[PDB]
């Protein structure tokens, strides 16, 4: 019975059968239970429970009263409750949700999965230190947010009560709401605040009703059907968690910038650094560390000739585009006819030399033979085989030993990744059917729905890639309850911050296992570099003051122009003195013998050319524009003057060498999938734009209805457009909307139809999985190489003294603060007056208790001894600080009111410093933080290079996208009043959003759209420079952040 191993196979067979039974559930066709298909299924479910209820009885009898056995018991008891409770209509369907745990039974049956899970479960206990840091981040930022912005997102511009009453009119809506309704609320700034958006910024009517919306008072709903708000700690954590995932964090920021103050970007800039970057990556570091702790034919010319033939044929395949001329199509087919014949000629020649048996011996020779038959088949069969022509690129593996070796390493990586992938599909499947039960037919139908297994699996994969996962959250919260946020918190936590970081650990562990003399003296002078470095810094200020809105006749413009001449002359002399002392190139130690000196040569050379063009009253405007762009690279001279920056830059360029092959393989997949996308999707990315297009089906009907026939910004018309779209897909920002366009594509001059071809999910989901795999071997490649580099390198006082030294006092304080932590989370918007008094009294008790602690501490140790320890100093600061906060509160109560209310609010917010006491107790957390501190010298310079990169691009963006405008005639999708390149200050903030990758594809869209005919000073080739601007910044920015993570990882490993 139980001894025989085949019994387990029988149990496994039933398990797989139970999984398919769950996957056939239809959310809102089986709830009625009136169909015959449901009737057979429920019987089929009942039969399966009988087996498992039977089996558990046999096993219990055989073995009597193993964690997995306990889980199996829990499923039986829970389902028995569901089964036995039948006949009671009170929450019968709700009890039906526990059956989603049945597939977990498969973990124990598969030995490989059981081992991996067991290893995973033994790594969790050491993640508590990271969890405590998560509590500090959420709790500190969760109360500061509530204290500042509690109830400020309800604000709306209302009509005056006297106005409506006296004039006896009630046709107007009570408060301004744009015609989209509550989906895009207009949040105003209260009179006592200084938010950016005021009720006087309301656009006029388009005699005027809008001008009478001139009262900003609290409304009756928060943004997104109440989902986004800070009215209490519960709703503040939903907002903070969404910011940590870097999805829609700007939208939350803009809401409080419009209502409270522009300087709220400080709150979100710190959160994205402390929480989104360091906290969410310290999880990766801890897991990875802990896992490690647990005759003519053979001629060279012939091979080169064949290699060239394949390469040229591949290039030809990528020259197709929409509206292709007929002659070009004919030429390509003739080219295909020739190339396949050439391979056929090679196919025959090799057969003769080695014979039929000899040719079969070579494995690559077998693959080539498979290609010739299909190539000839296509001609003789004269379109599905056309898509198979892309396989010819695989022939190049024969002649690339470096890539051939690399591909072998990646292929062998699948043996270790196979077990994990099986664990990810089970994880997704359980959450897919769980979602169906909760959000079944409740999303009234949105494309991101849980109405069926196919579209429930896709919506769970989309959430885990963090693309519009908040849009689903709002629908989930509104439909069922605000507590539905727990579904997304668990799905995003166990999936991205546990399972994904386990995959990286699997890979890492697998791999791991006379005048000239004067010049010579002046340049060699110690302070020469620092003197020059000061001039460069002053030159950065001049660059950062440039902006489009500078009036040419103003004094600022002349000042900027004059300084440019001064700095140009200064740096010419500095270059001139160096060359005289060292010589241009003739000498061995000549000036141009080092790249850094060469870099300064070009920067000086372009400056001289700029002067000449400026000297020239001629048609040279185009040249002046290019020069203005290259004059933003001047800050690059800082690297050679700072030894710390020079070393790190040379280190990053070194890290690119080990992963060079993977990059080349990654760039080869972009072209392969880019060419494939063009063939499938060229010319099909057009749609009819208008208020109502349910009738439109073709281009002509769109013109007849006086609507506009437009094209998607990200399409696959040609390999140029296909590569730009694939990069956006790979970045996982806006990747869903490109998928929707592919599914809806119908044909040339045809209106797309929703979910026309669901089979295209394979093209897009496959790309996002393959690319994520490569970009995971780049991170591992950097880590492994770094590890290689690192290895090679009085009686009344005595009782008081006993108490203070005793741990009793410390643990008592930890209890009081934990109570204070609870009390501080009691506050919410519009709390009852009784609560205000109760919380005020609770503050009194804490104040005196802390005061006694300081008094006892002073007596036990003495004034000089007590002040020595830094912890005691921290106590004194808060106790002194706490007294100041309470003192002002009582004066505010008192008749005198000289205290500005901002002071009282700031004091209340700053009283959260009491939580810092607990940091003393958490020895484990402190040691984790010490790891980052030990890594600061390496991470400090990488932060300097991050800011230098920001400065160059922030100043460059202003030059490029400075004059782009947003208007109802030319609407913008990513830019707004908050995200603009108008000046250096705003371009700096916009680039921070781009680095986080929040709707950065929307910003690029706004630069690709054609300018208005009437508008002037519009750069004709801007759509060509924009993709280069955003691609290079995204890749350069992400490479630096990866190295910061590797730097901390190494310090952790070498400390344990």
Ligand X SMILES: CCCCCCCCCCCCCCC(=O)OC[C@H](COP(=O)(O)OCCN)OC(=O)CCCCCCCCCCCCCC
Ligand Y SMILES: CC(C)CCC[C@@H](C)[C@H]1CC[C@H]2[C@@H]3CC=C4C[C@@H](OC(=O)CCC(=O)O)CC[C@]4(C)[C@H]3CC[C@]12C
Ligand Z SMILES: CC1(C)C[C@@H](CN2CCC(F)(CNC(=O)c3cc(Cl)cc(Cl)c3)CC2)CCO1
**Site residues (vs ligand NAG, CB under 6 A):** 160, 162-163, 212, 214-215, 695
* H-assigned helices in 894-1021: 901-910, 918-921, 923-934, 936-961, 984-996, 1000-1008
Determine the size of the site formed for ligand Z (CB under 6 A): 16
Among residues 474, 707, 992, 1039, the one that binds ligand LPE under rule CB under 6 A: 992
Per partner kind, with CB cut-offs from 5 to 8 A, the member of ligand NAG, ligand Z, ligand X, none near residue 999 is none
Stretch that binds ligand Z, among 54-62, 179-187, 668-676, 769-777 (CB under 6 A): 769-777
Query: Residue 580 Cβ, how far from ligand Y at the closest point, in Å?
Result: 32
- Residue 354's H or E segment, with its range, is helix 326-361
Of the residues 284, 433, 1019, 1047, which one makes contact with ligand Z according to CB under 6 A: 284
Q: How far apart are CA 995 and CA 862, in angstroms?
A: 52
The number of residues making up the chain comes to 1056
Residues 350-379 that bind ligand Y (CB under 6 A): none
What are the tokens at 1040? Answer: 């630096």
Give the sign of the dihedral formed by CA 843, CA 845, CA 848, CA 850: negative
Site stretch for ligand Z (CB under 6 A), options 463-471, 682-690, 734-742, 929-937: 463-471
The Cα–Cα gap between 471 and 469 comes to: 5
Q: Which partner, ligand LPE, ligand NAG, ligand Y, none, binds residue 162 by CB below 5 to 8 Å per kind?
A: ligand NAG
For residue 375, the partner it binds in ligand Z, ligand LPE, ligand NAG, none, with Cβ less than 5 to 8 A by kind, is none
Among 318, 742, 885, 1002, binds ligand Y (CB under 6 A): 318
Which of 227-235, 273-281, 419-427, 567-575 is the region at the interface with ligand Y (rule: CB under 6 A)?
227-235
Q: Which of 985, 1010, 1055, 1056 binds ligand LPE (CB under 6 A)?
A: 985
- Please tell me the distance from the alpha carbon of residue 407 to that of residue 402, in angstroms, as a whole number: 9
Nearer to ligand NAG by Cβ, of 191 and 386: the residue is: 191
- Least distance between ligand X and beta carbon 521 (Å): 37
Q: Which three-class secondary structure state does DSSP give residue 562?
A: helix
CA angle 634, 637, 642 (to 5 degrees): 145
Q: What is the largest CA-CA distance in the chain?
A: 109
By beta-carbon proximity to ligand NAG, the closer residue of 215 and 874 is: 215
Q: Which of 12, 19, 30 is nearest to 100 (CA)?
A: 19
Residue number with CB closer to ligand Z (278 or 343): 278
Q: Which residues make up the interface to ligand X (CB under 6 A)? A: 135, 138, 232-235, 237-238, 241, 384, 387-388, 390-391, 438, 480-487, 489-490, 652, 663, 666-667, 676, 730-733, 747, 757, 759-760, 762-763, 766, 771, 775, 778, 997, 1034-1036, 1038-1039, 1042
Q: Which of 748, 769, 826, 855 binds ligand Z (CB under 6 A)?
A: 769
Cα separation, 588 vs 152, whole angstroms: 69
- 36 backbone dihedrals φ, ψ, rounded to 5°: -75, -35
| Spatial separation of the C-alpha atoms in residues 790 and 803, rounded to whole Å | 48
The encoded tokens of residue 261 equal 């103050």
Q: Which residue is nearest to ligand NAG (CB)?
A: 160
Q: Extract the annotated binding site.
A: 45, 86, 88
Does 733 bind Ca ion (CB under 5 A)? Our answer is yes
Torsion (CA) 182, 185, 186, 188 in degrees, nearest 10? 110
Q: Pick out residues in 490-519 that bind ligand Z (CB under 6 A).
A: 495-496, 500
The reply on whether position 685 binds ligand Y by CB under 6 A is no
- What b/e sequence results for 687-701 when a residue is b if at least 16 CB atoms lie within 10 Å of its CB, and e otherwise? bbeeeeeeebebeee
Kindly state whether residue 977 participates in binding ligand LPE, applying the rule CB under 6 A.
Answer: no
Question: 323: phi > 0 → left, psi -120 to 50 → alpha, else beta; which?
Answer: left
As beta bridge partners, residue 970 has 967
Only one residue has tokens 């060292």, namely 582
Of 190 and 698, the one with the shorter C-beta distance to ligand X is: 698
CA angle 175, 181, 187 (to 5 degrees): 55
Joined together, the tokens standing for residue 860 give 């036990």
- Which residues have a Cβ under 8 Å from the Cβ of 372 and sit 6 or more positions away? 340, 343, 344, 347
Output phi, psi for 875, to 5 deg: -60, -45
Three-point CA angle 340, 342, 344, nearest 5°: 70
Cα distances from 610 to residues 142, 607, 925, in angstroms, run 53, 5, 56
Nearer Cβ to ligand X, position 976 or 1038? 1038
- Choosing among ligand LPE, ligand Y, ligand X, none, which partner's interface includes residue 992 (Cβ < 5 to 8 Å by kind)? ligand LPE
- Give 671 or 1003: the residue with its C-beta nearer to ligand Y: 671
Binding mask 708-747 for ligand Y (x = CB under 6 A): ----------xxxx-xx--x--------------------
Helix axes 249-257, 233-244, angle to 10 degrees: 130
Burial 340-371 (b: 16+ CB within 10 A, else e): beebeebbeebeeeeeeeebeeeeebeebeeb
Q: Is the dihedral of CA 9, 11, 14, 15 positive or negative?
A: negative
Cβ at position 208, least distance to ligand NAG in Å: 12
1020: contact with ligand Y by CB under 6 A: yes
Question: Residue 733 touches which of ligand NAG, ligand Y, Ca ion, none (CB < 5 to 8 A by kind)?
Answer: Ca ion
Sequence-distant (6+) residues with CB within 8 A of 215 are 157, 158, 159, 160, 199
For the bound state, the minimum distance from the C-beta of residue 279 to ligand X, rounded and expressed in Å, comes to 11
Residues 31, 319, 533, 603: which binds ligand Y (CB under 6 A)? 319
Of these, 688, 960, 986, 1034, which contacts ligand LPE (CB under 6 A)? 986
Binding partner at 1025 among ligand Y, Ca ion, ligand LPE, none, C-beta below 5 to 8 Å by kind: none
- Does 772 bind ligand Z (CB under 6 A)? Our answer is yes
Q: How far apart are CA 488 and CA 552, in angstroms?
A: 54
Shortest reach from residue 750's CB to ligand NAG, in Å: 17
Q: Provide φ and ψ at 975, rounded to 5°.
A: -85, 155
Nearer to ligand LPE, 240 or 986 (CB): 986
Cα–Cα distance measured from residue 1050 to residue 777, given in angstroms and rounded to the nearest whole number: 17
Contact status: 430 vs ligand Z (CB under 6 A) = no
CA distance 631 to 814: 58
- Residue stretches of the annotated binding site for Zn(2+): 45, 86, 88
Shortest distance, position 507 Cβ to ligand Z, whole Å: 10
Binding segment for Ca ion among 112-120, 511-519, 729-737, 842-850 (CB under 5 A)? 729-737
270 is an interface residue for ligand LPE by CB under 6 A: no
Do 632 and 955 touch, CB atoms closer than 8 A? yes
The CB-nearest residue to ligand Y is: 720
- Whole-number minimum distance, CB 549 to ligand LPE, in Å? 10
List the one residue out of 238, 274, 273, 247 whose CA is nearest residue 145.
238
- Does 1048 help bind ligand Z (rule: CB under 6 A)? no
Residues 473, 1042, 1046, 1049: which binds ligand Z (CB under 6 A)? 1042
Q: How many residues interact with ligand Y (rule CB under 6 A)? A: 37
466 binds ligand Z (CB under 6 A): yes
Residues 168, 234 contacting (CB under 8 angstroms)? no
Which residues bind to Ca ion, rule: CB under 5 A? Answer: 733
Which residues bind to ligand Z, rule: CB under 6 A? Answer: 284, 464-466, 495-496, 500, 732, 768-769, 772, 775-776, 779, 1042, 1045
Which residues bind to ligand LPE, rule: CB under 6 A? Answer: 262, 269, 983, 985-986, 988-989, 992
Which residues bind to ligand Y, rule: CB under 6 A? Answer: 232-234, 315, 318-319, 321, 540-541, 544-545, 547, 549, 667, 670-671, 718-721, 723-724, 727, 822, 825-826, 828, 951, 983-985, 1020-1021, 1023-1024, 1027, 1031
């Amino acid at each position: 019975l139980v001894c025989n191993p085949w019994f387990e196979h029988v149990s496994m067979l039933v398990i797989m059968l139970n999984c398919v039974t769950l996957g056939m559930f239809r959310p809102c066709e089986d709830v009625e239970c009136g169909s015959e298909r449901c009737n057979i299924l429920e019987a089929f479910d009942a039969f399966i429970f009988a087996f498992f209820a039977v089996e558990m009885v046999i096993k219990m009898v055989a073995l009597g009263l193993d964690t997995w056995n306990r889980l199996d018991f829990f499923i039986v008891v829970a389902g028995m409750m569901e089964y036995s409770l039948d006949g009671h209509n009170v929450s019968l369907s709700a009890i039906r949700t526990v059956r989603v745990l049945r597939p977990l039974r498969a973990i124990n049956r598969v030995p490989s999965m059981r081992i991996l899970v067991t290893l995973l479960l033994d790594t969790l206990p050491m993640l508590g230190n990271v969890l405590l840091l998560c509590f500090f981040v959420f709790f500190i930022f969760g109360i500061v947010g509530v204290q500042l912005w509690a109830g400020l997102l309800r604000n709306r511009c209302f009509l005056d009560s006297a106005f409506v009453r006296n004039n006896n009119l009630t046709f107007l809506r009570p408060y301004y709401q744009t015609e989209e309704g509550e989906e895009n609320p207009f949040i105003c700034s209260s009179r006592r605040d200084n938010g950016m958006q005021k009720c006087s910024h309301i656009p006029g009517r388009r005699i005027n009703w809008n001008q009478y919306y001139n009262v900003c008072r609290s409304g009756d709903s928060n943004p997104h059907n109440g989902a986004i708000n800070f009215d209490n700690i519960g709703y503040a954590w939903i907002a903070i968690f969404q910011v940590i995932t870097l999805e829609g964090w700007v939208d939350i920021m803009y809401y409080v910038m419009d209502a409270h103050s522009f300087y709220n970007f400080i709150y979100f800039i710190l959160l994205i650094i402390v929480g989104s970057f360091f906290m969410i990556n310290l999880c990766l570091v801890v897991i990875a560390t802990q896992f490690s702790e647990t005759r003519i034919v053979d001629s060279k010319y012939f091979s080169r000739g064949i290699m060239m033939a394949i390469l040229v044929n591949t290039l030809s395949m990528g020259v197709e585009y929409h509206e292709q001329p007929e002659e070009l199509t004919n030429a390509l087919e003739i080219s295909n006819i020739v190339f396949t014949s050439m391979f056929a000629l090679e196919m025959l020649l090799k057969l003769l030399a080695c014979g039929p048996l000899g040719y079969i011996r070579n494995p690559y020779n077998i693959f080539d033979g498979i290609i010739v038959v299909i190539s000839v088949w296509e001609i003789v069969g004269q379109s599905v085989l056309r898509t198979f022509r892309l396989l010819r690129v695989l022939k190049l593996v024969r002649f690339l030993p470096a890539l051939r070796r690399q591909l072998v390493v990646l292929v062998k990586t699948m043996d270790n990744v196979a077990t994990f992938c099986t664990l990810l599909m089970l994880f997704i499947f359980i959450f897919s059917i769980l979602g169906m039960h909760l959000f079944g037919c409740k999303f009234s139908p949105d494309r991101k729905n849980f109405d069926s297994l196919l579209w429930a699996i896709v919506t769970v994969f989309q959430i885990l890639t963090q693309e519009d996962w908040n849009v689903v959250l709002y629908n989930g919260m509104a439909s069922t309850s605000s507590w539905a946020a727990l579904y997304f918190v668990a799905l995003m936590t166990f999936g991205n911050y546990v399972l994904f970081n386990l995959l990286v650990a699997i890979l890492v562990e697998g791999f791991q296992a006379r005048f000239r003399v004067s010049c010579q003296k002046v340049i060699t002078h110690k302070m020469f570099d620092h003197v020059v470095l000061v001039f460069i810094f002053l030159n950065c200020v001049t660059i950062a003051l440039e902006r489009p809105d500078i009036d040419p006749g103003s004094t600022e413009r002349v000042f900027l122009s004059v300084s440019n001449y001064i700095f140009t002359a200064i740096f010419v002399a500095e270059m001139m003195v160096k060359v005289v002392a060292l010589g241009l190139l003739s000498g061995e130690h000549a000036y141009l013998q080092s790249s850094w000196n060469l870099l300064d040569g070009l920067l000086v050379l372009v400056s001289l050319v700029d002067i000449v063009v400026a000297m020239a009253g001629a048609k040279i405007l185009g040249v002046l524009r290019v020069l203005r762009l290259l004059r933003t690279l001047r800050p690059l001279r800082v690297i050679s003057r700072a030894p710390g920056l020079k070393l790190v830059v040379e280190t990053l360029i070194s890290s690119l060498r080990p992963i060079g092959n993977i990059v080349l393989i990654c760039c080869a997949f972009f072209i392969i999938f880019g060419i494939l996308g063009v063939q499938l999707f060229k010319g099909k990315f057009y749609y009819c734009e208008g208020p109502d297009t349910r009738n439109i089906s073709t281009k002509a009907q769109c013109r007849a209805a006086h609507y506009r026939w437009v094209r998607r910004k990200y399409n696959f018309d040609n390999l140029g457009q296909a590569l730009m779209s694939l990069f956006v897909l790979s970045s996982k920002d806006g990747w869903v909307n490109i998928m929707y366009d592919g599914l809806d594509a119908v044909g040339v001059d045809q209106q797309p139809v929703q979910n026309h071809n669901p089979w295209m999910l394979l093209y897009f989901i496959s790309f996002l999985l393959i690319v994520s795999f490569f970009v995971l071997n780049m991170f591992v490649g950097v880590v492994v190489e770094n590890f290689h580099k690192c290895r090679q390198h009085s009686p009344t006082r005595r009782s008081i003294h006993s108490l203070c030294t005793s741990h009793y006092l410390d643990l008592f304080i930890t209890f009081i603060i934990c109570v204070n932590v609870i009390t501080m989370s009691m506050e919410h918007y519009n709390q009852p007056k009784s609560l205000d008094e109760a919380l005020k009294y609770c503050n009194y008790v804490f104040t005196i208790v802390f005061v006694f602690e300081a008094a006892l501490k002073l007596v036990a140790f003495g004034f000089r001894r007590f002040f020595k320890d830094r912890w005691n100093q921290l106590d004194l600061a808060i106790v002194l600080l706490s007294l100041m906060g309470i003192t002002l509160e009582e004066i505010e109560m008192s008749a005198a009111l000289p205290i500005n209310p901002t002071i009282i609010r700031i004091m209340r917010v700053l009283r959260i410093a009491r939580v810092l006491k607990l940091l003393k107790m958490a020895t484990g957390m402190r040691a984790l933080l010490d790891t980052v501190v030990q890594a600061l010298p390496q991470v400090g310079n990488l932060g300097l290079l991050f800011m230098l990169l920001f400065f160059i691009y922030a100043a460059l963006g202003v030059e490029l996208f400075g004059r782009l405008e947003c208007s109802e005639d030319n609407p913008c999708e990513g830019l707004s009043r908050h995200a603009t390149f108008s000046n250096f200050g705003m371009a700096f903030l916009t680039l921070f959003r781009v680095s986080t990758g929040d709707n950065w594809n929307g910003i690029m869209k706004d630069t690709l759209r054609e300018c208005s005919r009437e508008d002037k000073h519009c750069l004709s080739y801007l759509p060509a420079l924009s993709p280069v601007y955003f691609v290079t910044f995204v890749l350069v920015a992400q490479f630096v952040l990866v190295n910061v993570v590797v730097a901390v990882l190494m310090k952790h490993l070498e400390e344990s």
